[PDB]
Amino acid sequence: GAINLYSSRHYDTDQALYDSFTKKTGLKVNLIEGKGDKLIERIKSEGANSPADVFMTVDAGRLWRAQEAGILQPISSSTLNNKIPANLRSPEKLWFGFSKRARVIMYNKNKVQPSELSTYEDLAQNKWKGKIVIRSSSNIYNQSLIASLIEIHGMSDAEGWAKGFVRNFARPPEGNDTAQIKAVAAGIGDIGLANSYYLARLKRSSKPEDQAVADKVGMFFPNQNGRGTHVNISGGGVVKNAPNKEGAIKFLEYLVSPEAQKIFSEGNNEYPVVAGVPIASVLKPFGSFKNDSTNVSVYGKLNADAIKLMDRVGWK
Ligand SMILES: [Cl-]
């Protein structure tokens, strides 16, 4: 038989994972690609007629939106629950993380030493005036990080932080996460926020200009002396009306195997979720880091609050 995998998270190296799955289970993987938000809308519009078995995307904020659209069904699996850390899966078992990213401080190594960095909260301090670059508030990764800060601090204390943070922008938000790393390399900012895997992607590039940017920029995992670094997921779930629910479950279970964890995580320079699986060579030089134990569903729950806060403080 077969499963229909609707994914915004596919890389071509994942074909090896699909082929291994098929060898192990007999199930073919039919891949349907699209942007994550577009795939949610697609599955919603397909309704009860949808062939989708598995939905995969990035960011718990987006997985939460999927869940609230009613397109997922809950799955109880010993294998998923044992192998996936509780903080990286939906409390309601609607979706599950399969690789992990961190939203980190990217810094210009010539201008900034790691001893100068500490927490997310410290980024609102006046010493950083004119020195921070970050992308738009319309980006989900930012929404999820600010949601986490609202959960910790409450709206009033988080708004105080955000006002200071925005005050420190070197320029109006412009470009994607990679653009922020480039701006840090070029001296437009001294620090920026971006996901871990974008630095690794530059490190691995064959383009000399990308390598030169990676040579100039370090990454710092914040809040190590306190709650830990903000982590988020690439993840997925079984679709509400899946025509092959058993096969869908088998696929999710296969993704937590050590083989699949390596292939899937390394395909986008992300970290495994499963304990004991070795980390990608490109990530090792940055070291291990304490992860916050907050359940990542919170970042979806508070997504609208994050958007509102960012609007209120003038984060463009
Ligand atoms: Cl929590």
Author numbering: 4 to 319
Q: Which sentences did the original study use to describe this structure?
A:
We have investigated the function and structure of Trichodesmium Tery_3377, an iron stress-induced protein (iron deficiency-induced A, IdiA) commonly used as an in situ marker of iron stress. Using heterologous expression in the model cyanobacteria Synechocystis PCC6803, we provide evidence that Tery_3377, a commonly used iron-limitation biomarker, is localized to the periplasm with a suggested FutA2 function as an iron-binding protein of an ABC transporter. The overall fold of Tery_3377 assumes a classic small molecule ABC transporter substrate-binding domain fold, with two domains hinged over a substrate-binding cleft. The hinge region is formed by two short β-strands and connects the protein domains via a double cross-over between the N (residues 34–133 and 266–349) and C termini (134–265). This type of structure places Tery_3377 among class IV iron-binding proteins (in keeping with Ref. 27) and allows for structural classification within cluster D of the substrate-binding domains.
To try and crystalline ligand-free Tery_3377 to examine structural changes upon iron binding, we citrate-treated Tery_3377 protein preparations prior to crystallization; citrate is known to chelate iron and was added to remove all iron from the protein preparation. Additional support for the plasticity in the binding of Tery_3377 comes from the observation of bound citrate in the binding cleft, clearly indicating the potential for binding of organic compounds. It is interesting to speculate that binding of organic ligands together with iron may represent a mechanism of siderophore recognition. The structural data further show a remarkable plasticity of the substrate-binding cleft, allowing organic molecules and potentially siderophores to bind in addition to Fe3+.
